[PDB]
């Protein structure tokens, strides 16, 4: 049994929040991966890289392991986590955890018409990390993912079906590339379109409707 320590966490444990769309709606900082695990039960991780790094720690040459892990729904919820640890499997597990924490949604949209489900993205987007820039362009239906297999796998863990990609910079260093692609798919909920010009009233948080609950006793 998991006990929370945060009042977001004991809201999530109380069954008072159903989806993460409240948390995504209210820009909340998450600090409990159990929230992500209880709200994304069909969240499927995948390791991207495990690599031994040789440390020099207080006259000791040792071997730790850098694990770059991506978690991701088959719908539009992605997460990236990079972790160095003394063991392989501990680095795997804590990289999974860090990817559970940094889950962001995506806005996958249409190309051209308005039929069925959104398959491609909704606009062009761009992410940068290091010198790696990744540019995402919408694609017609059934065109696959034109991307390098790391980036392609990070997009397959998003439910992005159709996208053209172009990069620039030294894309050899794959963690800069995955971070830049992660920024590019995070910025899709960041570009204001005319179909979202409609003024909306500000809804209240769960922090005050459920303020009498979930307080530290």
Partner 1 sequence: TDDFRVLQAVEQGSRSHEVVPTPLIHQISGMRSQSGTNRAISDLAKLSLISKMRNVKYDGYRLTYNGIDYLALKTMLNRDTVYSVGNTIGVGKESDIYKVSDKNGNPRVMKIHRLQGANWMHLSRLAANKEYQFMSMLYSKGFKVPEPFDNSRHIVVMELIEGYPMRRLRKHKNIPKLYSDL
Distance (Å, rounded) from C-alpha 15 to C-alpha 124?
A: 37
Distance (Å, rounded) from C-alpha 178 to C-alpha 176?
A: 6
> Shortest Cβ distance from residue 64 to partner 1 (Å)?
15
Kindly list the residues in this chain that would bind partner 1 in the complex (CB under 8 A). Answer: 56, 59-61
- Nearer to partner 1 by C-beta: 31 or 55? 55
Distances (CA, A) of 44 to 19, 71, 120, 173, 209: 17, 6, 21, 24, 32
Q: Is 44 exposed, middle or buried (0-12, 13-18, 19+ CB in 10 A)?
A: exposed
> Shortest Cβ distance from residue 60 to partner 1 (Å)?
7
3-state SS class at 72: strand
- Nearer to partner 1 by C-beta: 64 or 83? 64
3-state SS class at 217: coil
- Nearer to partner 1 by C-beta: 13 or 64? 64
> Shortest Cβ distance from residue 49 to partner 1 (Å)?
25
> Shortest Cβ distance from residue 184 to partner 1 (Å)?
39
- Nearer to partner 1 by C-beta: 54 or 117? 54
């Amino acid at each position: 049994g998991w006990v929370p320590v945060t009042k977001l966490g004991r809201l999530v444990k109380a069954g008072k929040i159903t989806t993460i769309e409240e948390i995504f709606l209210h820009s909340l900082p998450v600090k409990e991966f159990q929230i992500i695990d209880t709200l994304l039960p069909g969240l499927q991780d995948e390791v991207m890289n495990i690599k031994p790094v040789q440390k020099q720690t207080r006259a000791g040459q040792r071997t730790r392991f850098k694990a770059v892990v991506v978690v991701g729904d088959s719908n539009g919820h992605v997460g990236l986590g990079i972790k160095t640890a003394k063991e392989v499997a501990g680095a795997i597990r804590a990289g999974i955890i860090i990817a559970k924490l940094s889950v962001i949604p995506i806005r996958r949209g249409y190309w051209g018409t308005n039929l069925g489900q959104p398959h491609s993205l909704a606009t062009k987007t761009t992410g940068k990390c290091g010198s790696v820039t990744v540019r995402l362009i919408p694609a017609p239906r059934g065109s696959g993912i034109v991307a390098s297999p790391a980036v392609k796998k990070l997009l397959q863990l998003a439910g992005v079906e159709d996208v053209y990609t172009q990069s620039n910079g030294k894309t050899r260093t794959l963690e800069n590339t995955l971070k830049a692609a992660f920024v590019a798919i995070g910025n899709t909920y960041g570009f204001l379109t005319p179909n979202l010009w409609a003024e909306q009233p500000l809804p209240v948080s769960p922090l005050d409707i459920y303020s009498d609950e979930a307080s530290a006793q």
